[PDB]
């Protein structure tokens, strides 16, 4: 799920409250399609609505589908609203609050997003960008290891409960550590920015359980997205509810902070990417990974056979058996292809496409091997003496929506086990009624 899908399902009041922050409006704007952005920019300095036909005539006829999609997305996001123009026409004008906040974010005005930074002067224990990146990577690796369940990863109980709520892991028995499910493997195979966004969406969905304001959290997250790397900001100016969210982000590695009582916080590279190579793939089904961390080694070994582990290199072979085992574990071939494409070494970027077509085709064909046979439990009816009798029962089964397979030539039909009783009762009644 993406940002637009979540925003579409929100109530109009929540969307209106979201636009009150200049950072939120910019984040929504950058998620719009290319055609929509031009329309928004054109209507930026308009105080009167425009006719729908006039807006529609801007784009050529051949590209009308894209225009319709952009208009529908804008209406769903409530960026602009249809206005009852005098004379029976419908006028389109941007939301005044959204337009004002967008102009403030672009032209300028009001106060800064953050309170201040030079009030406390230079930081006594300021870190460096490589140190922040190392801290974020260590936190993310600790989280992912705790997903696996290694004793080396120790996190808060609230994080474990949140992971359980996300469905990644289940605790069959209290006290014993939870076991990661197939959805956990699929999430692990996902790209890190995708993983961060999915986790944040789950947090937003479950925030109502903790009594936290969705609008404030979204605005703060969007503000963090546009923050400059290596520059700190004042913690003060936020509610105590936002303090818990900030501490959770610090636990997740998005934001660095020396102490809980500290008034400074340093956004990391992960936080910036929240708004949105080391593997060399060879035609002989070999992966050469330039990684040292156990996380990438485990991820690669999930769907491949390891051969050599040099201190700064991993040589693995993608075999049919390993891919079949990984798919039986619950990972689809598309996820594997996407993971390989994302971690692609910069050298492979020259090739078009980056991943050789033969390897992707072979992986997809290996995926189809497991599901060659289709199994559907049901009850077969083959005792039809008359063609007309078969047709009526087939129509009744289709009405009940329990039909699986039909064959009018041989008068054969298959029904679901749940619907077998209903069809049997109907057939008994029809004979009695006859």
């Amino acid at each position: 799920r993406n940002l637009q899908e979540f925003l579409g399902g929100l109530s109009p009041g929540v969307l209106d409250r979201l636009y009150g922050h200049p950072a939120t409006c910019l984040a929504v704007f950058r998620e719009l399609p290319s055609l929509a952005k031009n329309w928004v920019m054109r209507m930026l300095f308009l105080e009167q609505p425009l006719p729908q036909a006039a807006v529609a005539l801007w784009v050529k006829k051949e590209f009308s589908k894209a225009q319709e999609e952009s208009t529908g997305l804008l209406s769903g996001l409530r960026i602009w609203h249809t206005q009852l123009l005098p004379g029976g026409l419908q006028g389109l004008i941007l939301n005044p609050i959204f337009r004002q906040n967008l102009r403030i974010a672009l032209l300028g005005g009001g106060k800064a997003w953050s309170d201040d930074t030079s009030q406390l002067g230079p930081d006594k224990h300021a870190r460096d960008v490589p140190s922040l990146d190392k801290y974020a990577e260590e936190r993310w690796e600790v989280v992912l290891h705790f997903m696996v369940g290694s004793p080396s990863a120790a996190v808060s109980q609230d994080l474990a409960q949140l992971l359980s709520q996300a469905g990644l892991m289940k605790s069959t028995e209290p006290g014993e550590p939870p076991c990661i499910t197939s959805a956990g493997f699929q999430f692990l195979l996902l790209d890190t920015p995708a993983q961060l966004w999915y986790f944040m969406l789950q947090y937003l969905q479950t925030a109502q359980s903790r009594g936290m304001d969705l609008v404030e959290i979204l605005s703060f997250l969007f503000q963090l997205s546009f923050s400059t790397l290596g520059k700190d900001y004042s913690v003060e100016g936020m509610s105590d509810s936002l303090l818990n969210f900030l501490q959770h982000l610090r636990e997740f590695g998005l934001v660095f902070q020396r102490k809980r009582k500290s008034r400074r916080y340093y956004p990391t590279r992960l936080a910036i990417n929240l708004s949105s190579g080391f593997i060399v793939v060879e035609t002989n089904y070999r992966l050469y990974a330039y990684t040292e961390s156990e996380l990438q080694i485990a991820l690669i070994a999930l769907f491949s056979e390891m051969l050599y582990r040099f201190p700064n290199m991993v040589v693995a072979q993608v075999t049919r058996e390993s891919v079949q085992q990984a798919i039986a574990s619950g990972i689809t071939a598309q996820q594997i292809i996407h993971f390989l494409r994302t971690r692609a070494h910069p050298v492979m970027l020259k090739q078009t496409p980056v991943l050789p077509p033969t390897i992707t085709d072979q992986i997809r064909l290996w995926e189809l091997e497991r599901d060659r046979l289709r199994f559907t439990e049901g009850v077969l009816y083959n005792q039809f003496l008359s063609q007309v009798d078969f047709e009526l029962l087939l129509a009744h089964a289709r009405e009940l929506g329990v039909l699986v397979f039909e064959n009018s030539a041989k008068r054969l039909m298959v029904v679901t086990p749940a619907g077998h009783s209903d069809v049997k009762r109907f057939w008994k009644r029809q004979k009695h009624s006859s």
């Binding site: 078009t352 496409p353 077509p357 064909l365 189809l368 599901d371 060659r372």
Partner: protein, 52 residues
């Protein structure tokens, strides 16, 4: 006959690797291509008889 031709075509052209590929295509992108670069790479990597 004409019916035999159709039956043989149905048996052959869609025996193993179509009963799932066609279903996936029915549940696929549907819309336009991602980028023009993808189409160029596909045309380069496709055989001459697959581009006609």
């Amino acid at each position: 006959g004409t019916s035999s031709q159709a039956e043989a075509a149905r048996i052959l052209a869609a025996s193993w690797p179509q009963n799932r590929e066609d279903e996936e295509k029915q549940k696929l992108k549907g819309g336009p291509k991602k980028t023009k670069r993808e189409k160029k790479a596909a045309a380069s990597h496709l055989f001459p008889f697959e581009k006609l």
